[PDB]
Structure formats: structure tokens, C-alpha cells
Design a protein around this nucleic acid. Structure first.
Ligand SMILES: [Mg+2]
Ligand SMILES: [Mg+2]
Lengths: 8, 142, 828
RNA sequence: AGGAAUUCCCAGUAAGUGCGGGUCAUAAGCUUGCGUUGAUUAAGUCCCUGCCCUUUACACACCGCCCGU
């Protein structure tokens, strides 16, 4: 899991 | 793309009330309920009723075969038997008996038709007995 | 403990929504000056030369899907996603007509030439024609099987042609509401449909390079009209046809695909077609001198010609054409409208007034006058009251940004590990610092006016101070995983960071030493905030829950469901322990940290909310969403009471015997009326059943009577209606219709009224007609069935005879017997 | 001789009258037996107020598709 999916 | 074109013509033929021409398409499209509604509509109309048997002759062979198996279901119901009996009358008198034997499924068709048609004859016989009450009323009127 | 309501004040930052169509409007006698563009739940009127909004038209909770201006120019029809159709008067700006026939988004709206009739198409497979002047719906057409793409009137013969997402083109006779002709040519969706050459040619766009055309001639036999395949014209674009449009009373046909380029075609008609044909013949004669059907074929292919195509910066959603030089207006994925002039050059743009992408970061100034909104490749500053963009600066990208305590400068974060600083007055970038290796996710301002802290994809957390303005790094804090959020206490004692692992770790600012750990979320924490006192910290995760924690001991006070999706942002109001949160469930909610209660819900946006910001005064809140819009909420004086708000969401024939009597009475009245009408030559119930004789109408009433209730209804009926029924019964038997039902009814009345009938001499003629008719008809029906006795029984015997020949005989006999044994249930 | 409201009641029933017992619980100005005299109206509908169910054993005869999200 990466922050690009969750937040951006 | 074929059926929707055939359906469009069938939807048209009902609209201008051309029931005689609608007989061929609905039988070819295999719609028993649509044919039954049209057959009822033809008979109520006076001039269309007499030209009904003339139309049935012009149909090709296979249309009469699928038509015959439609009358099996119609003769089962008491509300729909009269339109079936009129049609079955045309097939017997017009076409040769040996040619009726040549039809496919005619043996299975005859099995169902005989018991239900026998039932209708008894019901009409009782009505004829009840119709005699009119003659009794006439003699007793002053 | 009383709460105060937040109300949406204004919507800004939007030029034109991606869904909808752009239309030219006529205001103050200037046809090309003003345009109407759709936005989220609103439609805006813009002046292209001036660049300002002349008028806004109010909407109600639903997005606008399509637009159609009235032919007179006073009105413009608006269609919504719900299915309601509303018409606005341009001069007044207020719409008082609502049409809600459809149950899905209104795909298309078109007017007739006069303007009295309006036709609407929806994603539900229906077309509804409305009476504009009478404000009523005329009729509904239900032929299509998929969503409606196009619907066009025909002036000459009162006909409507429609296309759909199904591969069908359907022709309708509006007088009878009947579909008389259907086209089955296309293999795919028919996206476009236009009329050209004075309703003599039909043009369709499909998902292919070829563009087909048909010629129509007025009169399976064809009815009303016939259409033949004239030919096809090629398209440069290899993709699907998004739109086909023809400007009013013009010769320009515009074809548009998914790509940015718009294709224009010019038709040749009247003398121009004839002059070109004459010129071609002379050139052919000159060729013959140097050394027709082919010349005529060449003329037919060259009937429509290709003028130079317009190219735009980005892909186009909708376009409009007007011809007095051709003026074309466009709408893009970017909220940007452009006009091009061709007999191509760009004349104007309205790029000012909104960002070119979704606003990811959002901030307020130290005072309440200024609002900072930044997105990809753009930074803009908004005045809170006056609501226009003060200044714009280009940027690499935007993820986080705080407003420096000085009112002159700004600081932003980027997806690349960089920081940029600008002056508002100068409008230039001061310097670029390679702060972080990876993406920089969060940035926090110090309680005192000196310094700030950055965290990002690079696992370290770095501290910065201000030094013409410049920043330098004091010290860095290195961690094991990615850093989601950095925000430290109103006192400079404690620092709180969020990691990729489902934990929030608290560090002492002075010593950079571990103090506390917060765990219990299934998914990593996206947003965090700390109250003004410093007692409570609220954490929101990708999982729907939000948890309140005390700073003193790291104890969890409460866990709340909050939104239906992941929460994106959380922030406390300055004065008290109330915080605002926004998630991907289209909503904004506020909560009371002390009482763990849900007070309010803001329901303005139509897409997921990226960011949120609250004023330092706490009066104003601004949010950004996936829909390219920015909305402002303000606090109101009206007090809010919780349980009164809670209940707001909770809120948000005739008998058979009597029927025979009325049928007879209606028959009596009409036969008198027809007698008077014929004499002059020398009701609504009847048309309701279709035009039939009054004698016929009585028949279906008898058919409608249930069989069980038949006998007592006849017993109830008085002798006054009896002689009329006997006359009507005689008419029924002669036609031969439902003889079994009528005779059963007829025989019952004769028995029960036998004595009274015999006395009345007036009934003597009646039964004489009845007596001759009844036995004659019943015998005829019985004979027809009786004739079927002989034919069926004889054919039965012939089939039995054939089986005898076959009779291996035992096997055949066993097989023949085996067929004729049915099975019945029996209690032994 | 007991208003407004309200409760109960179909045959040896409603109502009146007397005579006993205190029975391993209950019962004292109350509890429970037993006998005597003995009626008016009603034997059917779903209209109001409600309740219980259904709308997928092929003699004759009859009958011939519940609807929507
Ligand atoms: Mg009393
Ligand atoms: Mg007593």
C-alpha cells in the first residue's frame, strides 16, 4: 500500500 | 435485424386494422397469442369473417401446420374453443384427408383434440335443450 | 451548550463543469457576446469580451445535465440529473416552470421551430413531449430500449426522429404516437443525428471512421417516407463521434471526436451545386477536346466539402456554432472556454477565475481577508468577501501549504521534494529548496512565529526556520516508515507524527525522544489535529472510524463511525473543542469532542472532498472537491438544537347490479341524441373505450361481471329495464358474440319473470325475434362442432389403421402400449 | 332511585330468594357450596373497530395469470 492511493 | 423489421411490419399491420395480412406474419413469427387475438378480431368484423377461409387457402404448407398446433391449446380453454372450432372446420373441409395425414405432429394433435371437442359438444347440447324454453313461452303468451 | 448553524454562502472557482453542453444566448440584442455554461448544480452566464458573470441561475441540490435555449430567446430550458426540467427567463433570472416526468438524467432537450412543444430524452428509455405554453405534458413515447441520444422534430409532416444508445433509429408519428419506421443499419451506438438540406438528408454519427448519410423522400412497404443510403464521408479521427452539430440556417457541419481537434464540413446547395456541376461539365468537354454519369457521380460525392479544421489546446466536451465569419465556442476538461474565428484564430479566453485541476491544498491567511487555493501547476489567492483572484503563480505541483505569519509571503509543498516561496505583491518565486528526497505530504506551522516542520515520503522528518526570505534546516528526525501527517501542540512541548504503519507516535520537541504511541486503527491515519488547549487529539484513518485521544496519558476517549468512506481532513475550530471533518461520502460534518455528538452536516458538494480549511476567527470554512468547485460556509446567529435537527433527518367500486342500470340508462340517452343529430342533418365514456356503438358498450359491462355474482345481479334488476335488455340481447345473438354468456343470462330472466312477461302484450314482438334467433344460432354453433366430430374421428381411425400394418410384433405392441398409460394418485 | 362517561351479558342464561360448610392455600361486615322461582331480544353480516390466514387429491360440473420497489 502506498500513500498515493490513500491520500492523493 | 430481421425480426425487428418483421416486428415493425407486424406492429404496423395491426394499426391500420389489416388483420387478414397480419395472419401470415404472426404465424411465421410464431406468436400463438397474437394470432388468437387477431382471429377473434376478424370474426367480430362482419366482412372479414366471410373472407377468413379464403385467406387460409393462400397460406403455404408450413403455416397451416403450426396453425394446427395452435388450435390444440385454444380448444382446451372453454372461452377460446369457438375460435378454434371455426378454424379446425376450415382445415377439414378444404384440404384432403390424406394430406392431413402428411402433416407433422398430426397424430399427437389428434390425441388432444378429441376429448376436449367432445366436451364442447355436450355443453352445446344442453344449451339447445334450454333454448326450447322459448317455444314454451311463446304458446303461453296471450 | 447551544450550537450555531453553518450555511453555504457562495460557490466560486468554477468556470464550466465537464458534464453539460455550451450554448450561445441572446441578451440585450448581442447574439455572440453572451454564453451560458453549466456548473455544479448551477448554470452561469458569462460575457466573453468583459470576462465577468452577468447572471447566475439558481439550482436545487442536483447537477445540471443539459441545456437548451428557447427559439424566442427569452427562455432557456435546464435539465438535471434527477430528471426534473426547469425553464428560466433570462431577463428576470427566475424560473417558475418545473417538469418532472422522467426518472433519470435528462440526456437531451430540444425545441420545435415555433417553441410551443418541448421534447426531452433521458437515460431511462423514454421520450416525453411537453406543452410549453400550457405547462403540461402531452404524451410519453416508450419504443426505445437504451438511453436516448438525440431527438429532432420535423416541421413538414409533424414527425419526430430519435436515436438511442441501442443500434436503432426510430421514426414517430406524433398525431397517433406510433412508431412506423425503424432503421437497423448501424452496428454500434448512434451518438449523433442532425437534419440538413431542408429536411431532405439525414446524417448519423457512430463509433467508426465512416460517417453515413441518407436521403429522405416523402410520399414491407414503406409508409409516410422512404430513406436510401446516399453514401458515406470519411473522418480524420479514428475514434467515436462525441457530437454532431449544425448551426441554425447554415451550411456548416461540425464533427467532433474524443480528440482535441474539431472537424468542420461545408455543404454545397442551390446555385452553388448547379454552378459546380456546370463547371465540371465544361472541364470534361475541354478534356474531350484535348483527347456524363461519372461526372454526375463526382458531383454527388463533392456535394459537401471539407474546410480547414479547428485545433484546441485540450480535448473538447461541448461546442456551439453561430454564423452571421464562423464563431465557435468550446468547453474543455479544463474549466476553460475559448472562441475561435474562421471564414482559424483565437479571440478570447476566460482562463481567469478557476484552477486548471482539482484543488489539493487549501489555506487561509493570518487575517480573514485572504484565501489561498493551490492545485497542479497553479496557485491562486482569493479575497473572502469580494471573491476574485488577486494573483496567480505557476507551481510544479501542490500537496500541502501553510501561510507564513507575514502577510506578504506564501510557502507550498510539491510532489517532488521541493519547497517554493513567493511574495503576493511581487508574484515571483524566491528560491527552490530540495528539502525531501520523496513526496512531501504534510507541513505544520510553529506556535511561535518562527520556524516550521516538514514531513514526507522520505522517512526522515526535518525542522526548518526562516532566515528577502529564506529557510534553512536545523535538525532532522529519522523514522522507520513513511510519514503521513506532522502537527505539533499549541505549546512547543510535544510533536505528533503519523506513520504508514497504523500508529501515531508522539515525540518531545526539545529532545526528539519517544513519549507516547497511539494504535487501534485498521488502516493508516490520514488526518490529525490538536485542540487549542492541547488536551485532545483527534485521528482519522482510511477506515471510517475517528478516535479522540488525551495527550496526558494516551487514553482513547471515544470512537465514532463518522463518514461512510475514508476521512480526508480534520481540523478543530479555534475557540472550543469542536472539529470539522470531511470524507469521500460527499459530506462535511462537525462534532463536539466533549460530548461525542454529531451536530451538523453540510451537503453542498457532489463529489469526494479533498481538503478543508477553517478561518482563525472560526466564522468561515472553505472546501474543495473532485468536482472543480470551491464552496464557502459561514456561521449564523440562529441557534441550533440537537434533537430538533435529529427529527429532520427522520423526515428527510360500483356493484354489478348497479353497473347494468347505468349502462342501460346511458344507452337510452344516446340513442335519443343520435336521433336528434340525424334530424338536424335533414358520450366521453364511449371514446374512453374506443369509438364503439352504444349497444356495444353494454356488452363489455356484462363481460366485466364476475361469473359468481351474475345470477343475483339479474335477480336484483327491476322489470323496468327488462324489455330493453331483451332487445339488446337479440342484437347480441345475431352478431354471434359470446352466445353462451348471453343465453345463460337470457334464460335466467325469462324464468324469474315468466308470469309478468306473459301478461304484457308489448313484449309479443320481442320474443318472436328472440325465438327465431336463439335456436337458429345455437344450432349453427352445435353443427360446427358436430361437423368436427366426423373429420377428427375419421382421421383418428386412419392413424390407427397405419399402426396395425407395423404390428418384433410384441416389442411394437409393448412400445405402443407404453405410450398410453398416464399416472394418477390414489388412496389405497 | 342516583348525570357525563364507562363495564359486563345468549337458556335453566339475566335477575330475586333462602339454607349450609370454613374443608393442610386464600377467605370474617368476608369466601365457597347447595336448592327454590325463572324471563325480553337474537340464531346474521363485514358497514365502523379489530383478529387469523392465503393470491401456484385434474370424477362431472365450474373456472382460466395479483401488483410494485
Ligand atoms: Mg339504578
Ligand atoms: Mg343468595
Amino acid at each position: 500500500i502506498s500513500v498515493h492511493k490513500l491520500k492523493l | 435485424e430481421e425480426q425487428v423489421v418483421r416486428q415493425q411490419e407486424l406492429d404496423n399491420l395491426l394499426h391500420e386494422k389489416r388483420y387478414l395480412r397480419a395472419l401470415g406474419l404472426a404465424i411465421s413469427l410464431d406468436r400463438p397469442h397474437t394470432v388468437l387475438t387477431v382471429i377473434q378480431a376478424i370474426r367480430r368484423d362482419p366482412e372479414a369473417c366471410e373472407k377468413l377461409e379464403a385467406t387460409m387457402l393462400r397460406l403455404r404448407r408450413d403455416q397451416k401446420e403450426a396453425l394446427l398446433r395452435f388450435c390444440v391449446t385454444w380448444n382446451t380453454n372453454s372461452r377460446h374453443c369457438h375460435e378454434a372450432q371455426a378454424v379446425l372446420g376450415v382445415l377439414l373441409r378444404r384440404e384432403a384427408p390424406e394430406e392431413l395425414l402428411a402433416y407433422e405432429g398430426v397424430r399427437a394433435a389428434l390425441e388432444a383434440l378429441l376429448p376436449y371437442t367432445e366436451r364442447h359438444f355436450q355443453r352445446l347440447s344442453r344449451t339447445l335443450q334450454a333454448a326450447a324454453f322459448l317455444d314454451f313461452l311463446w304458446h303461453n303468451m296471450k | 451548550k447551544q450550537y450555531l448553524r453553518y450555511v453555504a454562502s457562495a460557490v466560486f472557482g468554477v468556470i464550466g463543469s465537464q458534464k453539460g453542453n455550451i450554448v450561445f444566448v441572446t441578451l440585450r440584442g448581442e447574439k455572440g457576446r453572451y454564453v451560458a455554461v453549466p456548473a455544479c448544480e448551477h448554470v452561469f452566464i458569462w460575457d466573453l469580451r468583459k470576462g465577468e458573470k452577468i447572471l447566475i441561475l439558481q439550482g436545487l441540490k442536483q447537477e445540471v445535465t443539459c441545456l437548451c435555449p428557447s427559439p424566442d430567446g427569452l427562455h432557456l430550458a435546464v435539465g438535471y440529473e434527477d430528471g426534473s426540467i426547469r425553464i428560466f427567463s433570462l431577463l428576470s433570472g427566475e424560473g417558475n416552470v418545473t417538469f418532472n416526468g422522467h426518472k433519470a438524467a435528462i440526456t437531451t432537450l430540444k425545441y420545435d421551430q415555433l417553441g410551443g412543444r418541448l421534447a426531452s430524452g433521458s437515460k431511462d428509455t423514454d421520450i416525453i413531449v411537453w406543452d410549453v405554453i400550457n405547462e403540461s405534458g402531452l404524451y410519453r413515447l416508450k419504443g426505445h430500449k437504451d438511453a436516448i441520444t438525440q431527438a429532432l422534430f420535423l416541421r413538414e409532416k409533424n414527425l419526430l426522429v430519435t436515436s438511442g444508445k441501442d443500434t436503432m433509429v426510430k421514426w414517430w408519428d406524433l398525431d397517433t404516437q406510433h412508431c412506423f419506421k425503424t432503421m437497423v443499419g448501424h452496428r454500434t451506438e448512434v451518438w449523433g443525428l442532425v437534419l440538413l438540406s431542408e429536411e431532405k438528408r439525414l446524417i448519423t454519427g457512430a463509433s467508426d471512421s465512416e460517417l453515413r448519410v441518407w436521403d429522405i423522400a416523402y410520399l414491407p412497404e414503406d409508409r409516410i417516407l422512404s430513406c436510401r443510403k446516399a453514401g458515406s464521408i470519411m473522418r480524420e479521427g479514428r475514434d467515436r463521434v462525441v457530437n454532431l452539430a449544425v448551426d441554425k440556417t447554415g451550411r456548416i457541419l461540425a464533427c467532433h471526436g474524443t480528440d482535441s481537434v474539431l472537424e468542420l464540413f461545408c455543404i454545397l446547395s442551390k446555385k452553388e451545386i448547379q454552378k459546380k456541376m456546370d463547371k465540371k461539365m465544361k472541364k470534361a468537354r475541354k478534356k474531350a477536346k484535348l483527347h456524363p454519369e461519372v461526372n454526375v457521380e463526382m458531383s454527388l460525392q463533392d456535394e459537401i466539402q471539407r474546410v480547414t479544421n479547428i485545433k484546441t489546446s485540450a480535448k473538447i466536451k461541448s461546442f456551439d456554432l453561430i454564423h452571421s465569419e464562423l464563431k465557435a465556442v468550446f468547453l474543455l476538461q479544463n474549466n476553460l472556454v475559448e472562441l475561435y474565428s474562421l471564414n482559424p484564430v483565437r479571440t478570447s479566453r476566460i482562463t481567469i477565475g478557476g484552477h486548471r485541476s482539482d484543488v489539493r491544498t487549501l489555506s487561509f491567511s493570518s487575517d480573514n481577508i485572504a484565501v489561498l487555493s493551490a492545485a497542479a501547476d497553479s496557485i491562486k489567492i482569493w479575497n473572502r468577501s469580494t471573491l476574485q483572484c488577486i494573483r496567480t503563480m505557476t507551481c510544479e505541483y501542490a500537496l500541502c501549504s501553510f501561510f507564513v505569519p507575514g502577510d506578504r509571503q506564501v510557502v507550498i509543498g510539491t510532489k517532488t521534494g521541493k519547497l517554493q516561496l513567493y511574495d503576493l505583491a511581487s508574484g515571483n518565486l524566491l528560491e527552490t529548496i530540495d528539502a525531501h528526497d520523496g513526496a512531501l505530504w504534510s507541513m505544520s506551522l510553529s506556535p511561535d512565529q518562527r520556524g516550521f516542520v516538514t514531513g514526507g515520503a522520505d522517512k526522515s522528518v526535518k525542522f526548518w526556520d526562516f532566515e528577502r526570505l529564506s529557510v534553512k534546516q536545523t535538525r532532522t528526525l529519522q523514522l522507520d516508515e513513511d510519514v503521513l501527517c506532522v502537527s505539533y501542540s499549541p505549546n512547543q512541548k510535544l510533536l505528533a507524527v503519523s506513520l504508514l504503519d497504523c500508529t501515531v507516535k508522539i515525540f518531545y520537541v526539545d529532545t526528539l525522544k519517544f513519549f507516547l504511541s497511539l494504535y487501534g486503527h485498521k488502516l493508516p491515519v490520514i488526518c490529525m489535529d490538536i485542540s487549542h488547549d492541547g488536551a485532545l487529539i483527534a485521528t482519522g484513518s482510511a477506515d471510517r472510524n475517528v478516535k479522540i485521544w488525551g495527550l496526558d496519558f494516551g487514553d482513547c476517549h471515544k470512537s465514532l463511525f463518522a463518514h461512510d468512506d475514508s476521512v480526508m481532513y480534520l481540523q478543530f475550530v479555534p475557540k472550543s473543542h469542536l472539529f470539522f471533518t470531511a470524507g469521500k461520502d460527499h459530506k462535511i460534518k462537525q462534532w463536539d469532542a466533549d460530548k461525542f455528538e454529531h451536530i451538523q452536516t453540510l451537503e453542498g458538494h457532489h463529489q469526494e472532498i479533498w481538503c478543508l480549511a477553517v478561518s482563525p476567527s472560526g466564522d468561515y470554512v472553505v472546501s474543495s472537491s473532485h468536482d472543480k468547485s470551491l464552496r464557502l460556509w459561514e456561521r449564523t446567529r440562529e441557534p441550533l438544537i440537537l434533537e430538533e435537527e435529529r427529527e429532520m433527518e427522520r423526515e428527510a367500486t360500483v356493484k354489478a347490479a348497479e353497473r347494468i342500470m347505468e349502462a342501460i340508462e346511458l344507452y337510452r340517452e344516446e340513442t335519443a341524441k343520435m336521433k336528434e343529430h340525424k334530424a338536424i342533418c335533414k358520450n366521453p365514456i364511449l371514446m374512453a373505450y374506443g369509438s364503439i356503438s352504444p349497444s356495444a358498450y353494454v356488452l363489455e359491462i356484462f363481460k366485466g361481471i364476475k361469473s359468481s355474482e351474475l345470477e343475483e345481479s339479474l335477480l336484483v334488476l327491476p322489470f323496468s329495464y327488462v324489455p330493453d335488455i331483451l332487445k339488446l340481447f337479440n342484437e347480441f345473438i345475431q352478431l354471434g358474440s359470446d352466445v353462451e354468456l348471453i343465453c345463460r343470462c337470457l334464460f335466467f330472466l325469462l324464468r324469474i319473470h315468466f308470469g309478468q312477461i306473459t301478461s304484457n302484450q308489448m313484449l309479443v314482438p320481442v320474443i318472436e325475434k328472440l325465438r327465431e334467433t336463439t335456436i337458429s344460432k345455437v344450432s349453427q354453433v352445435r353443427d360446427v362442432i358436430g361437423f368436427n366430430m366426423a373429420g377428427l374421428d375419421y382421421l383418428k381411425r386412419e392413424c390407427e389403421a397405419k399402426s396395425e400394418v407395423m404390428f418384433s410384433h410384441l416389442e411394437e405392441k409393448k412400445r405402443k402400449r407404453k405410450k398410453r398409460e398416464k399416472l394418477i394418485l390414489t388412496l389405497t
